[PDB]
């Protein structure tokens, strides 16, 4: 039972366990969200088929780890899908020739939020897969673990909907200008969606936000978002209606807002977070 990664790195055997680095391409689907498909990037074979007909199974206890350790889903395995983490030993995959074939596994996630996502960083842990090997012949049984690491930075969605970008930067033209904000929302199934604005407001109406400039800050001027002329205060929901696979622009615009009397030139900055809620 030899193996190697997508980048050609042979996965060591000889120590009880291993570290594996793979490329993650999460995508939102209906009911499930894909995390990683190891059919693309793990290839195993049998260097001495005449002498053995190996089997491999995903022993119970295999689970998400690292930052995903609290999540649950399913695992595609050898022709069928089972719940994940595994409460029981799965059926047996068979390796009986020197020719490589993929490790037919893929990990899914049961949505637990609206939009939302947890940021994976390269060199982090993804999941711990307890594996059990056996054979036709030598009355000989082993177990070994593969720690699954991501070698590329991604964000793993946890809701039924995704957005164009997680971090967005918009450069206001000089006072008193405004700009459109390129944000859009799409959902794999026809869903309702709203959103409310999170940030450190500055005013009594909670509609304007304070400057955060760390260098020669301007004073008396704060940001104020609006959609088609609607002032969208903080901690308030604005509904998108029914959202499907067609991405919907939030309709947000970024403005200046005059707070507290006289003004002084200088930089201006404000960081805003958008949260989505099912409706």
């Amino acid at each position: 039972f030899a193996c190697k990664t997508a980048n050609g790195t042979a996965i060591p055997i000889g120590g009880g366990s291993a570290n594996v680095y793979v490329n993650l391409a999460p995508v939102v689907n209906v009911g499930q969200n894909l995390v990683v498909d190891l059919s693309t990037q793990i290839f195993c074979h049998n260097d001495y088929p005449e002498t053995i007909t190996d089997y491999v199974t995903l022993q119970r206890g295999s689970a998400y780890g690292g930052v995903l350790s609290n999540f649950s889903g399913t695992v595609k395995y050898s022709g069928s899908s089972y719940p994940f983490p595994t409460t029981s030993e799965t059926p047996r995959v068979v390796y009986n020739s020197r020719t490589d074939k993929p490790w037919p596994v893929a990990l899914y996630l049961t949505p637990v939020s609206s939009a939302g996502g947890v940021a994976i960083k390269a060199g982090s842990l993804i999941a711990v897969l307890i594996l059990r090997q056996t054979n036709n012949y030598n009355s000989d049984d082993f177990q070994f673990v593969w720690n699954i690491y991501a070698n590329n930075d991604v964000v793993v969605p946890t809701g039924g909907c995704d957005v164009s970008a997680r971090d967005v930067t918009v450069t206001l033209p000089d006072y008193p200008g405004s700009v459109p904000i390129p944000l859009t929302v799409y959902c794999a199934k026809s869903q309702n969606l709203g959103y409310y604005l999170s940030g450190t407001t500055a005013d009594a109406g909670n509609s304007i936000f304070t400057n955060t400039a760390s260098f020669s800050p301007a004073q008396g001027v704060g940001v104020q978002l609006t959609r088609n002329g609607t002032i969208i205060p903080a901690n308030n929901t604005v509904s998108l209606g029914a959202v499907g696979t067609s991405a919907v622009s939030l309709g947000l615009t970024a403005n200046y807002a005059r707070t507290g009397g006289q003004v002084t030139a200088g930089n201006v900055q404000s960081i805003i977070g958008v949260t989505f809620v099912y409706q």
Partner: antibody, heavy 117, light 108 residues
Framework: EIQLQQSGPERMKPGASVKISCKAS????????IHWVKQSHGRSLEWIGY????????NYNQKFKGKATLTVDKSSSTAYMHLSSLTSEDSAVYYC??????????WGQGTTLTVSS | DIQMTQTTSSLSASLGDRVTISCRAS??????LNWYQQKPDGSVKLLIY???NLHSGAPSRFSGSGSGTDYSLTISNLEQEDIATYFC?????????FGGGTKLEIKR
């Protein structure tokens, strides 16, 4: 609900090649496997193979691998069963079936193939 | 391959009875064994999966149990709807295999 709608009965000469389809609906087409099963006219059930409708990986029963072939169209959520170089024995009923937890939890209505001269 | 087998091809049952159908596996399987029911119309359905689990929608009078190389299905009280053929299939090791089938008759 989950339903697998197949094409109507076929009738081909020996030596022809036929293509059955199975239009899945009611669930995420890419998140589950699809299997194909042959019920010969002895009424015994036989297993052909599976295809993953996300990456199009297939495994074929050793009995048919040189004769059958599975393919998928992700856009329309439709799978296809193709069988070539027909003969008398290929007269049977063919089912497209989902899979979950080691079980074929939903089947199609079946498609009758007649290989008649 | 795995040569699944069902003990009897035809079961001369009678209404109200408690019939049990048992199949054997040529080698053990970790309880990955399923029960299917085919009506005379030809349509096939899944009854029970992983040796004791009732599929979502099946009648709540079907039961299964067994340990590697010995499994069985039981109906508590026959209804006329239950006259059909029954197959068991192992999903442990590819290629998946089915049994010979057992047809459910009425005695008279």
């Amino acid at each position: 609900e989950i339903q697998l709608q197949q094409s109507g009965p076929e009738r081909m000469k020996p030596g022809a090649s036929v293509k059955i389809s199975c239009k899945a609906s009611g669930y995420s087409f890419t998140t589950y496997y699809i299997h194909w099963v042959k019920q010969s006219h002895g009424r015994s059930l036989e297993w052909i193979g599976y295809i993953d409708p996300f990456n199009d990986d297939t495994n074929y029963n050793q009995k048919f691998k040189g004769k059958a072939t599975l393919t998928v169209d992700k856009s329309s959520s439709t799978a296809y069963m193709h069988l070539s170089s027909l003969t008398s024995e290929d007269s049977a009923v063919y089912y497209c079936a989902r899979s979950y937890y080691g079980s074929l939890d939903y089947w199609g209505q079946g498609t009758t193939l007649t290989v008649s001269s | 391959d795995i040569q699944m087998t069902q003990t009897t091809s035809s079961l001369s049952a009678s209404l109200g009875d408690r019939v049990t159908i048992s199949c054997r596996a040529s080698q053990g399987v970790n309880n990955y064994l399923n029960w299917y029911q085919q009506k005379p119309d030809g349509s096939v359905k899944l009854l029970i999966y992983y040796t004791s689990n009732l599929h979502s929608g099946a009648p709540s009078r079907f039961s299964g149990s067994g340990s590697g190389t010995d499994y069985s299905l039981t109906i508590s009280n026959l209804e006329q709807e239950d006259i059909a053929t029954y197959f068991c299939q192992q999903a442990n090791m590819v290629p998946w295999t089915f049994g010979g089938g057992t047809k459910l008759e009425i005695k008279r």
